[PDB]
Design a protein around this nucleic acid. Structure first.
Ligand SMILES: [Mg+2]
Ligand SMILES: [Mg+2]
Lengths: 119, 57, 238, 49
RNA sequence: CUCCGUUGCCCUCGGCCGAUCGAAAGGGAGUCGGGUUCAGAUCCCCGAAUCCGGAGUGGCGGAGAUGGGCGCCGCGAGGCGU
RNA sequence: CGGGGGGGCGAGCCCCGAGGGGCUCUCGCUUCUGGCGCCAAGCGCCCGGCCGCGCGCCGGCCGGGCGCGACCCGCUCCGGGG
């Protein structure tokens, strides 16, 4: 005597368990391939890019094409012990992703050019 | 204003402060009031006339 | 007055169109899924149709008073469980190489379970009683058995529940069962059942063999057909 | 209702049973004015609509 | 481990309506002046903005919200008890 | 739904004692007006804690649970064919 108020039968909601696999299904976890040496390929040194460094506190980077801005930002930060105001990406007709990276005002591009070797 | 904009606006821009405020138009509320008597009262008048018909019968 | 004036009544009325209707049980006004609907109207057909004798006999069965003696009787007598089996062997392995053992003992009398086991030892007249489950799924497997049993003059019987018959022998289900021998002391109770059973079965056959058992309509139809015989009685009985 | 000579009428009853309001579409009988209560079913009285 | 969170199960409530795609012209919140290049500019910069989401611990104000009565004590502003 | 059974305001008939009963009908109760109407009141019966009487299924306070309300049984989810 648990009466039926509704005139449908809806399936009873059963218990359903969580995977307790007897092995892992692949041995090891895949080594991460988008790194803080791989996501950035090279800084550009084009005249319209030197002009962009000196005048706008930016750096012009070619970047690995699967990169996001929060990846390009935690890359450029990690490496040229820098910090980044904002990233701003395009895809060159060629498939190379550019990303020109504004560096916070406390902090200069024209110095960090000579550190990374460009100029 | 275009409806998604209503999410920005304050409560008071979207109603007027009443019964059925901001959905219904005064003129229909104040009939809904004085309809809601006379429906109610004349169930009472039928209630007593029924009671008197069964008191007679 | 220990009765606050406010708690009133507000008694509702669920006439058509008056106050909104409440929640009754609807078990007949509900959508019975395709297994249920189906199994429901197997049981109906299986009464509605004209069922054959041989399949009917698998309705009429034992009663509490008889059944419970049977299943008492068997409980002295269930075939060795596993574990219980192991120590029948293990004890003879230690008793053989210690304090003598020819090792035939005396195999104590027990049940006999399956059909093509039973039917052989019914066809051999090696059975005092045979218990048959009624609800067996392909009925094929036990249609004959009663006929066979009465020809050999072997007391057969039809107990309810292939489960509770298949719980004696330690399984899910079982269709038949049999006592070939009994312990001497336990033979008064066996011969008590046997005589009680075969008044009721083996010596009935021309009552069972010619009894069709369905052809029963639905009570909704029956209530209507009978309500026309109060019209036809009360036309020219008045 | 396009491609159809008769006008329809939306008539809101209410579900005798769930707190709600079923609405339907009757083919408008002539003399259906807007604001009519339309009585339906066995015991209903014999008038238009 | 306070209180809160998280999860486990137990009880409780839920009609829908079709696994899914379909607009670079239909539906769809919110960015614009000025500046700048050889080529790009509501895209870069300067300044003014704005939407959506998050804000828990609640960041800070303001509302909820600060009476009245009665009773005392105090000249009176007033203080206290309820 | 089909049977049953409650109800009962009421009609026919039957009975009747004039209280009433039985059988039949009726209902199953919403029609003058762009009104409101769900998640249950009421009664009942119980149990947890806590407080008071102290015998505590006495009484209060706090907190729950089931029954009626919302008759009972079934065998085809309702309808029309065959
Ligand atoms: Mg799409
Ligand atoms: Mg568009």
């Amino acid at each position: 005597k648990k009466i039926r108020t509704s005139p449908t039968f809806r399936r009873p909601k059963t218990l359903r368990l969580r995977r307790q696999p007897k092995y892992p299904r692949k041995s090891a976890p895949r080594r991460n391939k988008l790194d803080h040496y791989a996501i950035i390929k090279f800084p550009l040194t084009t005249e319209s890019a030197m002009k962009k460094i000196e005048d706008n506190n930016t750096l012009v980077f070619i970047v690995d094409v699967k990169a996001n801005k929060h990846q390009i930002k935690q890359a450029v930060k990690k490496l040229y012990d820098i910090d980044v105001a904002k990233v701003n990406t395009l895809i060159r007709p060629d498939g190379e992703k550019k990303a020109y990276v504004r560096l916070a005002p406390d902090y200069d591009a024209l110095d960090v050019a000579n550190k990374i070797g460009i100029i | 204003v275009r409806p998604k904009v209503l999410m920005r606006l304050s409560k008071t821009k979207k109603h007027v402060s009443r019964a059925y405020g901001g959905s219904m138009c005064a003129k229909c509320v104040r009939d809904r009031i004085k309809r809601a008597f006379l429906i109610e009262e004349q169930k009472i008048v039928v209630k007593v006339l029924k009671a008197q018909a069964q008191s007679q019968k | 007055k220990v009765v606050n004036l406010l708690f009133e009544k507000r008694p509702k009325n669920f006439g058509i169109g008056q106050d909104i209707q409440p929640k009754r049980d609807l078990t007949r006004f509900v959508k019975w899924p395709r297994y249920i609907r189906l199994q429901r109207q197997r049981a109906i057909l299986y009464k509605r149709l004209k069922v054959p004798p041989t399949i009917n006999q698998f309705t009429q069965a034992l009663d509490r008073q008889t059944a419970t003696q049977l299943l008492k009787l068997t409980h002295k007598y269930r075939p060795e469980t596993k574990q219980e089996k192991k120590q029948r062997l293990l004890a003879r392995a230690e008793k053989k190489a210690a304090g003598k053992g020819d090792v035939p003992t005396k195999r104590p009398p027990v049940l006999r379970a399956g059909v093509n086991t039973v039917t052989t030892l019914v066809e051999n007249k090696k059975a005092q009683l045979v218990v048959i489950a009624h609800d067996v799924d392909p009925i094929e497997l036990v249609v004959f058995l009663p006929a066979l049993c009465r020809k050999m003059g072997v007391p057969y019987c039809i107990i309810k529940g292939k489960a509770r018959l298949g719980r004696l022998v330690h399984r899910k289900t079982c269709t038949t069962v049999a006592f070939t021998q009994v312990n001497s002391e336990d033979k008064g109770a066996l011969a008590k059942l046997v005589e009680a059973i075969r008044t009721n079965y083996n010596d009935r056959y021309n009552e069972i063999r010619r009894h069709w058992g369905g052809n029963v309509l639905g009570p909704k139809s029956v209530a209507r057909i009978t309500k026309l015989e109060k019209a036809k009685a009360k036309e020219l009985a008045t | 209702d396009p491609g159809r000579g008769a006008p329809l009428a939306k008539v809101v009853f209410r579900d005798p049973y769930r707190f709600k309001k079923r609405t339907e579409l009757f083919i408008a009988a002539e003399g259906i004015h807007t604001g009519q209560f339309v009585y339906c079913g066995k015991k209903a009285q014999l008038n238009i609509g």
